[PDB]
Every structure is written in C-alpha cells, then in structure tokens.
Amino acid sequence: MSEMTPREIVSELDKHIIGQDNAKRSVAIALRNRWRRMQLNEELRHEVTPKNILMIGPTGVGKTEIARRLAKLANAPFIKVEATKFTEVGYVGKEVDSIIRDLTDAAVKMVRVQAIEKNRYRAEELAEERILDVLIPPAKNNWGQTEQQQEPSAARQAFRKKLREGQLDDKEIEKQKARKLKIKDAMKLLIEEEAAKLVNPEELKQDAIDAVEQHGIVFIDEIDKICKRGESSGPDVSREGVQRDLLPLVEGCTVSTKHGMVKTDHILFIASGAFQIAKPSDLIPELQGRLPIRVELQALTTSDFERILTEPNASITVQYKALMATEGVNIEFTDSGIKRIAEAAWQVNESTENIGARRLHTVLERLMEEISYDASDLSGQNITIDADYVSKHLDALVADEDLSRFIL
C-alpha cells in the first residue's frame, strides 16, 4: 500500500511543479487526512469526510498539474472535468453522474496496463514452455523429480537461448487453437493469448472498482465560472444549477455504471479556478462547505520559469536534448539562454495576454524550428544554444507583438 508522510508527498511534487509550496502542502494534507481515516474504526471510517480542496489562482501556474501529479503518485485514478461542459448554453443535455462513470473507465485502462509488467515478466517464461515443446517434445511420462525437467534442457535449453537470435520457422502449437502459422508471428501472439490465462475475472473489475471506490481524485475545473455575482459573468442562475447537480457527488451518493455500482462518498475532489469574476464566498453554501481546504497559487516568475525550464525532472529543455539527440545532435542550453528563453516568455506573456508557464512550450518549439528541422543533417554536429542564439530567432517576434499574437 501507498501513504507517504505529508512532506514525502510534497517532495515528489517539487520534483515536477516549481514553487507554489503552499499549494502542494494542502493537497498532501488532504491525502494523509485521507489515509488517517482508514486507520480508525467503523464509526469514524464513515463519519469523516474527504478533505476536498479549493484551488484559487491565475492560469497556467499549476492548479491542474499539482493535482494531476499528486494523483499519479497517490497512484490514484483521476479525472479533470471542465465545469463549463455541464452548462450546455448550446442547451444539449448534461448529467453530472457521468463524471464518476469516467473515473472508472480509466480505473481500468489503468488496471489493465498496470498489470502488463507485473504479470508480463511472469509469462515470457510461460510462452517459451510452449515452443520448447514443439521443437523438441519432453517424451511421454514425466518420472517426477522436477530436476529431470531442466534435463530435457540437454538440448532444449540450447534452443531456449537460440530463440533470441534465430527465428522465422514454420510451427504449430497448442476455444484453444489447432493452428498452423510461423514463429515471429506466434511469438508476438502467445504472449497476448497468455495474459488471458493470467486470470481476468472479477479481479480486473471488483478491484478496478476498488480503484475509484478506495479513491482517486476529481479535479472539477473552473468551478468559479459556474456561479453567480452579476454583470459580464452571470447569464442566469441557469448555471447555479450545475453547482447543485454537482453537490451529491462531492456530498456523497452512489452512482450507476458500467463496471459496477460505484460509491462517490469517499472520492477526493479538487476544485480549481481563478475568480477574477467572483469570489469563492460565492458558491452555493452547500458546496462552499465541502471545499474545506482553501489555498492560493500566485503567478510564477521569469526565474520561476527559467527554473521550470530545467529543475522539472522531465524538464522541457531535456525533452529537447534527448529528442534532438536521436538525430545525432548534442544540444546544450546555456545558463544564459535558459535566461533569455524565459525572459521572452515573460515579455511575450506581458503584451499579448499571459497564458502561464504555458508560453515556454510554444516559445521553444519555435526556437528549434531551425534545429528541430535541419537536425538529421547535423549527424554528430553539436550546438550551443545560448542568449546570442535565442535572440537571433527571437527578439523580433517578441518584437512584432501582432505576430506573436499568431505564432507564440
């Protein structure tokens, strides 16, 4: 099982989300206040109430990714539903118990794929027993010693080591089979047709169910755009409603679905958004109060950037190096470009409109349009990417405001 202490939770955070400590902090305080529970009895296993979180602040500084990530290391199943959607001011038809239904549909194509390296390496030593079986059969009547089985190997395990270097031969092996095929096929087959025997009844469900149930985490994005305070950001309280609908979810219900009936009850909720338009004080009271833990995030810096450009472990930048290396190019970003790199983000974000950390992403892939293209030429060649570089393909762009409008 998972847990992690408060700080532990944080620290893996600072691994991919620069700054906003306060932020992290809370979310972890929610995720232990979580664990804690379990460890009680039955009374209070069921009278204490997922400490759901309200995420006030500007855009692109990481409310989402703070959640997204928290959850990945919780190893919780997770989904982010935009608040908008349930509005349909195009007037369609939106039901909110859907949300829970998709927090299962990952809670699966999550259980699945998170079962093919736990039970994959367990059955490449079971797809071999099925070819060292057709090239040379362990002659009828095994005289039980389990050590006269590694004794077929007296040539059998000479073919076992010869499966990795010489294949493409015509063979046929044992709703079963009885089929005559070929070996590089078949090798790619059995595998598949073997994960099946790696039992998938009321296990990939029931426990996938447990998934959601135990908990993930839903991040209800934008909540603020669904509540009133008049003028420009009120049509009707034909939005107020979606706060209502919502309630139950957060406030605790069962729900109908596909793989099994699910209990929202204990699910964790993380409600986002910026409120230049209203004020959290402005939710329906009901909601207001299921959002116990409130926290601010604040806009990142120039530095903050620079640092997001490199101190993220998946770093953007690196994404480059490696990507870029693949064509035979070392690439290497100075202190002093990683400086302008940011520097631009910030200047651009300040003239057009500011989209968050977001800009770096675009500013970059643009830096490289040159390199990133010609790359397969540079076969070995290496390049120095630095201020003086940067500014040559940037400055006038960033310069041209109205271009940036289009193309950054």
**Residues annotated within a binding site:** 18, 60-65, 221, 286, 358
Tell me the closest approach of the beta carbon of residue 17 to ligand ADP, in angstroms.
4
Q: Cβ of residue 67: shortest distance to a copy of itself, in angstroms?
A: 14
Closest CA to 317 of 386, 379, 394, 377: 386
According to CB under 8 A, which one of 33, 272, 310, 317 is a site residue for a copy of itself? 33
Give 211: exposed, middle or buried? Use CB within 10 Å, 0-12, 13-18, 19+.
buried
Closer to a copy of itself by CB, 24 or 339: give it: 24
29 CB contacts (<8 Å, ≥6 apart)? 6, 51, 293
Give the nearer residue to a copy of itself in terms of CB position, either 28 or 218: 28
Q: Which member of 32, 130, 160, 307 binds a copy of itself (CB under 8 A)?
A: 32
The yes or no reply on residue 157 touching a copy of itself (CB under 8 A) is no
Q: Which does 134 bind (CB under 5 to 8 A by kind): a copy of itself, ligand ADP, none?
A: none
The entry of ligand ADP, a copy of itself, none that residue 137 binds, CB within 5 to 8 Å by partner kind: none
Report 326-385 residues binding ligand ADP (CB under 6 A).
356-358
CA 122 to chain CA centroid, nearest Å:
26
Q: Which candidate, 269, 265, 261, places its Cα nearest to that of 243?
A: 269
Distance CA 340, CA 347 (A): 10
* Residue placing its CB nearer to ligand ADP in the complex, 61 or 408: 61
Distance CA 79, CA 270 (A): 10
Rounded least distance, CB 16 to a copy of itself, Å: 9
Judged by CB under 6 A, the chain residues 55 through 84 that form the site for ligand ADP are 59-65
Residues 356/302, Cβ–Cβ less than 8 Å: no
CB 204 within 8 A of CB 111: yes
Q: How many helices (H) and strands (E) does the chain have?
A: 16, 11
Q: Which residues are annotated as a binding site for ATP?
A: 18, 60-65, 221, 286, 358
The H or E element spanning position 56 is: strand 53-56
* 54-62, 71-79, 241-249, 257-265 -> range binding ligand ADP (CB under 6 A): 54-62
Q: Applying CB under 8 A, which of residues 263, 307, 328, 391 lies at the interface with a copy of itself?
A: 263
| Among 55-63, 131-139, 159-167, 331-339, the segment contacting a copy of itself (CB under 8 A) | 55-63
Do β-strands 268-271 and 172-173 pair in parallel, antiparallel, or remain unpaired? unpaired
Site residues for ligand ADP per CB under 6 A: 17-20, 59-65, 300, 308, 312, 356-358
